[PDB]
Amino acid sequence: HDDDSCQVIPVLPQVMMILIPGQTLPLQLFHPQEVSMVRNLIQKDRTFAVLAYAQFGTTAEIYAYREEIVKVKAIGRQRFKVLELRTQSDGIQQAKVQILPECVLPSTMSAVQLESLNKCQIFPSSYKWWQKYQKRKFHCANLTSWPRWLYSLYDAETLMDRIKKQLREWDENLKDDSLPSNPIDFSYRVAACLPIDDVLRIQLLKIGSAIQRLRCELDIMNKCTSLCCKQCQETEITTKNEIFSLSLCGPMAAYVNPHGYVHETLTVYKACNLNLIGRPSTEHSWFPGYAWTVAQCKICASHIGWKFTATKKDMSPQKFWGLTRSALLPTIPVILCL
Amino acid sequence: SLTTCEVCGACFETRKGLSSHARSHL
Amino acid sequence: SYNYVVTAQKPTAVNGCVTGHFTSAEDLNLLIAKNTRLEIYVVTAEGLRPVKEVGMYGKIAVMELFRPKGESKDLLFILTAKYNACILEYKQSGESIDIITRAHGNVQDRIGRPSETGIIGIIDPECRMIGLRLYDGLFKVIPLDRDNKELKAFNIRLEELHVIDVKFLYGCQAPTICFVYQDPQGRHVKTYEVSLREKEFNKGPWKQENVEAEASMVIAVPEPFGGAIIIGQESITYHNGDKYLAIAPPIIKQSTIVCHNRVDPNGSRYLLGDMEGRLFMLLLEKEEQMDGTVTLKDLRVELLGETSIAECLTYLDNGVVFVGSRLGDSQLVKLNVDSNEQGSYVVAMETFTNLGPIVDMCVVDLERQGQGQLVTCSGAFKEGSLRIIRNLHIRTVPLYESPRKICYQEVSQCFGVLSSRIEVQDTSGGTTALRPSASTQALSSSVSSSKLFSSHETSFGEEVEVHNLLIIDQHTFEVLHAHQFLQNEYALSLVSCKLGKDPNTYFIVGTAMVYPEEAEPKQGRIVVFQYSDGKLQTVAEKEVKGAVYSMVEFNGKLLASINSTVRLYEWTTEKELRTECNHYNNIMALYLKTKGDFILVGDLMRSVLLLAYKPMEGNFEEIARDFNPNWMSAVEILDDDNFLGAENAFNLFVCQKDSAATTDEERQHLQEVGLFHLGEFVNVFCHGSLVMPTQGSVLFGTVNGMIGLVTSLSESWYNLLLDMQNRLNKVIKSVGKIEHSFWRSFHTERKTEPATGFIDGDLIESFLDISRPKMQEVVANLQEATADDLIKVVEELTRIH
Ligand SMILES: CCN1CCC2(CC2)[C@@H](Oc2ccc3c(c2)CN([C@H]2CCC(=O)NC2=O)C3=O)C1
Ligand SMILES: [Zn+2]
Ligand SMILES: [Zn+2]
């Protein structure tokens, strides 16, 4: 579309969600009113509107359409602000939408670049390397009223490595396509893969620039080092340090239960103040080798996740915990900055 | 069967136990 | 509101300098480029004769002379940053001298990634074509074979998408470019031939598939040898078909080569300059073979001397070299036959004032006359200085280190300057300074003694900055005291104010502790100094938990920003700082301004946040905010409702509080009420005037040493001037035939919107310099009003500066 267009887009009715650009939502449309829309959509723009509930949301574009009922799969693309809402008789809802802004900015030193220096800006393809990176990319900081290290705090490529390095303390694993190269894309991945609650998510989606959004996500990863029960708010479950990745998968992948319920499940070494419900089992144990025991807040008995315990004696770790993103609330043991 | 949670997979002795659990999800 | 901008000081930094035959075939000219301005001299055996200095509606990015088939004297190709391309010719009706645009057009491409190494513009040795490398992957070709009055071009595709530097080669049958590019496997040099017939590339004469990792300069050797010299960090290599001569001069591995000029038309002596003012000569040792041919025996490099940090170099004649500088003054230097006591063949034989970069400034009435002089932190490194500018006359105080912030303490008749010095880790186990300078040679010195903080495998050669507070006398401009701050401490804010019921006037310095490991600054210091018996003593230090980015006296208190917190401070009876209130924002408080009880906060990204200190309550209350993300460099309060700022790229802008107090959402938001492409990069905004219908006076310095005034206008006035502007734009002739409105249009990297709420006083004032016939034409039919009454109105305006 256009970064600040006013477009109209149909709303998947009962669907309710925060959709981060670049997330896929699987949908099964059976009510007849709905399947009609999907039909029109897929013949036309193939994009509907996922609302935040609230005057915000994301557009979702369809990349998979199978009629059995209509079964679809959409990717999130653009964030918007609701302007109007036609709740037509059919039961579907049309929406006047303002596309929120993805400001893309040049390098900080682009304007202050000394012509003579322009033929050194291409660099030839580790602490020392990034020390030189900053000494060379921001050399022309001497022409301004600010120092080099300040400009690094707004330099997309630095911000991103800063984020990678932390994310690696959670998953000694990949470092290549593992994460995107476009600040915008990378910014959006981080948001959907941090252990944050929907409000934090909504903040990042309301941020206008990929640079401001990376700075934010960094602030989240540096200040909200404690994860509490979202429901009673008075129970610290686990701390940033205890995050790890059981397999390549990652530290909070999405797993499916025998009933299609999905669970972004952050694996942590130790959790606290949790009561265990029942006897361990192994059915559909997402982590083959350990058994699961349901876990809940000792104060409000809200579901937090499971406790995985090793069947064998070889395996390490012997115990760990899986906590589902929707139960958790990040907390600062002070605001988040742009 | 009647006493397992569809969402987290918990199993109660009783089909009331299961409803008081269903709250804690909503 | 509505605002009026006028130039008080043209840009002084030189950004490019070519030596050719522009005024006549028999004259040696030096054309010099200063951002918007072109300067044309004649090279006499006594020195430089001025000829004509013109203004372009653009930023000069390519400036090259060339002599196509069927031309008496050279012609000038200029290409501006907004992609305006022109070809200019000289023409003097005995007394009348005009620069006529023979061709023009905007060479921009609707799509295309701007190349990282920026706009390159070359001309084929046989003037067959102009080459432009504007976008990664493409190459524009302006055929010169015929009158390309409109600069009709064509875009040859190019597969190498990161080309560093590119020049046409000499002595080859068909037009040939030689370029250094980088891909995964390294940096490589390739040629191509340019087929205009076929409007694409054909194979080239030669290639070399792995050259010096940081090769950056391609120099095309002229017809005698033919080929190209590839310059890099440590090696100076030569390539031609099968010849490959490579050297690694030890002398060049101290600093990086960024300049070159060809001295002899045959191309066996090239001047070379680095980033530390070293001036080198590279001599192509030739081999005169009997067959009649010549081979390249050896490459030698000789150190000639030291000059201003050079942006561009041209030899003139009789051993005179022009040095174009942006960090310091430009100069003429004479190269002698023998060396000197130390060994510098160089001797400075002239200099030219450059106030750029203007990092900080302040306005001050040193003579108690009601006029007002301007004192600037100017330049960097060895060129650093104070400049004193009065109505204009300029006194330069050389500092030999970088001034960063300046403030006037009238009580003690001196200036406070925060300055940095580069030193380098020494083999004795410490650090050595690179040369004497302000901190080094101040009558008295002091070194902070805090113990508030606690923090050997570095690198011999690694450089370090040493931050000092300088106390310079306002009359002798001598360095009286030099206070050296803590090791690993980076000074940021400076203030001279009396605080509380205390009668002393103090020096307040805000700092931040920086370590290469920790990205975000987690600790800092507000220090309170007082200068009295020739010595600076420390009154109180408040150790903060962040970087003090700005300090302002706030009606007797001290308003400081610590990272994202706007903190208000009071001076106690016991001479210490107490915290009244805090205000925590969601941006970093890089910029802090106050008019009365209003507070302006901004960060690097044009985030604006208007606070206010509710006096009875003793807290701050958010009045309004705006987020229009973009790089912002400077910002100032015009009045209690309007706010002025500088953003990328070289644009100014003004937003105002919604004066229309309608609803909460409206009243707590600032509307954009002014957009103007300036052309300079504003570093500091200073309320003041250099003198004594318009209301206000805000002066600004820029990186190019251009000084500006902004003044607020009256709805009636703005409209009337608006008409003048267009009225004029019909009569005043552009140099590249560039539209005033294009040039002033607000210009980001990816956006371009037309200017608003600004009057270009530079154009307005040009009315008094046009012909009284033409004057009447621009006044025709408006109340029509004569010239003579408009000649008055402008005169009032010239008086503001
Ligand atoms: C197939 C066994 N069963 C039989 C009874 C039942 C009603 C039909 C289902 O009872 C579950 C419901 C829901 C869930 C589970 C089991 C198991 N489970 C998680 C636990 C953590 C983990 O690691 N993997 C999981 O799949 C659920 O969310 C399926
Ligand atoms: Zn709880
Ligand atoms: Zn459950």
Tab-separated table of C-alpha atoms in Angstrom, chain A residues 103-108 110-125 127 131 135 139 141-151 153-155 162 208-209 211-212 215 334-338, chain C residues 116-117 162 164 182 187 213-214 216 258 275 311 326-327 357 359 381 404-405 463 465 490 492 514 516-517 519-521 549 564 584-588 590-591 603-605 607 629-631 648 650 681 683 703 749:
chain	number	residue	atom	x	y	z
A	103	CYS	CA	9.943	5.679	8.565
A	104	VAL	CA	13.165	4.491	6.987
A	105	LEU	CA	16.144	6.752	7.628
A	106	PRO	CA	19.609	7.181	6.095
A	107	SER	CA	22.860	6.691	7.986
A	108	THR	CA	23.475	9.197	10.771
A	110	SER	CA	25.161	10.512	5.558
A	111	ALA	CA	24.739	14.307	5.657
A	112	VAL	CA	27.944	15.034	7.573
A	113	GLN	CA	30.127	12.863	5.400
A	114	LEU	CA	33.333	14.497	4.199
A	115	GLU	CA	33.554	13.949	0.425
A	116	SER	CA	37.227	12.933	0.655
A	117	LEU	CA	36.211	10.308	3.209
A	118	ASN	CA	33.403	8.866	1.046
A	119	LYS	CA	35.721	6.371	-0.686
A	120	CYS	CA	36.547	4.670	2.676
A	121	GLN	CA	32.955	4.059	3.767
A	122	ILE	CA	32.810	0.642	2.153
A	123	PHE	CA	34.316	-1.582	4.734
A	124	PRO	CA	36.022	-4.898	4.063
A	125	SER	CA	33.501	-7.630	4.752
A	127	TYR	CA	35.209	-6.557	20.396
A	131	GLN	CA	35.641	-0.719	18.136
A	135	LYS	CA	35.898	4.761	14.968
A	139	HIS	CA	34.692	9.666	12.225
A	141	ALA	CA	31.178	13.074	14.402
A	142	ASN	CA	33.885	15.637	15.130
A	143	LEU	CA	32.075	17.954	12.768
A	144	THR	CA	28.955	17.858	14.928
A	145	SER	CA	28.094	18.642	18.502
A	146	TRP	CA	27.877	14.961	19.587
A	147	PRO	CA	30.398	12.142	20.193
A	148	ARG	CA	30.829	8.874	18.275
A	149	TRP	CA	29.391	6.588	20.972
A	150	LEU	CA	26.153	8.610	20.914
A	151	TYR	CA	25.682	7.958	17.208
A	153	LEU	CA	23.155	4.191	20.040
A	154	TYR	CA	21.066	5.163	16.966
A	155	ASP	CA	22.970	3.120	14.373
A	162	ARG	CA	23.681	-5.721	20.430
A	208	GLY	CA	7.256	4.625	13.863
A	209	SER	CA	10.838	3.697	12.946
A	211	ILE	CA	15.639	2.282	14.690
A	212	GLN	CA	13.370	3.505	17.479
A	215	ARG	CA	16.239	0.756	20.788
A	334	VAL	CA	11.590	3.585	34.970
A	335	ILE	CA	10.094	3.659	31.445
A	336	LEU	CA	10.845	2.088	28.085
A	337	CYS	CA	12.629	4.485	25.705
A	338	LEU	CA	12.662	5.188	21.937
C	116	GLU	CA	27.584	4.408	-0.526
C	117	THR	CA	30.715	6.149	-1.796
C	162	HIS	CA	29.739	-1.887	-4.681
C	164	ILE	CA	34.539	2.194	-4.525
C	182	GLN	CA	34.059	-5.149	-3.571
C	187	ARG	CA	38.186	-5.970	-3.621
C	213	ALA	CA	41.787	-4.888	1.021
C	214	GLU	CA	41.153	-1.166	1.572
C	216	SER	CA	40.055	3.346	-2.368
C	258	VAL	CA	42.479	10.948	0.683
C	275	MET	CA	43.890	13.044	7.060
C	311	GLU	CA	40.013	18.049	1.513
C	326	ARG	CA	37.161	21.889	5.725
C	327	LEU	CA	38.474	21.251	9.217
C	357	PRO	CA	32.977	23.338	11.342
C	359	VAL	CA	30.451	23.159	16.625
C	381	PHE	CA	42.148	18.480	15.691
C	404	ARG	CA	33.569	21.509	21.762
C	405	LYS	CA	31.555	23.849	24.004
C	463	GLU	CA	44.699	6.906	20.334
C	465	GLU	CA	41.086	11.653	23.926
C	490	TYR	CA	33.760	12.571	28.409
C	492	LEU	CA	29.333	17.078	27.395
C	514	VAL	CA	32.365	6.062	28.744
C	516	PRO	CA	34.397	0.870	24.966
C	517	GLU	CA	32.552	-2.154	26.356
C	519	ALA	CA	27.222	0.881	25.038
C	520	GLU	CA	24.878	3.005	27.043
C	521	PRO	CA	26.415	5.478	29.523
C	549	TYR	CA	23.735	15.679	27.827
C	564	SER	CA	15.954	9.969	29.605
C	584	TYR	CA	11.090	10.696	33.120
C	585	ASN	CA	10.513	10.605	29.369
C	586	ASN	CA	10.416	7.944	26.677
C	587	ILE	CA	13.241	9.596	24.676
C	588	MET	CA	16.785	10.654	25.541
C	590	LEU	CA	19.799	15.256	24.210
C	591	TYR	CA	18.489	18.824	23.653
C	603	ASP	CA	16.473	13.633	20.781
C	604	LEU	CA	18.446	12.762	17.684
C	605	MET	CA	15.248	11.636	15.918
C	607	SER	CA	11.198	13.692	18.814
C	629	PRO	CA	11.150	10.502	12.965
C	630	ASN	CA	14.234	11.907	11.218
C	631	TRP	CA	17.728	12.988	12.277
C	648	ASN	CA	18.256	15.901	7.650
C	650	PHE	CA	20.230	20.282	5.567
C	681	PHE	CA	24.079	21.431	8.601
C	683	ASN	CA	25.152	22.615	14.838
C	703	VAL	CA	29.567	22.722	9.504
C	749	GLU	CA	16.792	10.975	1.456
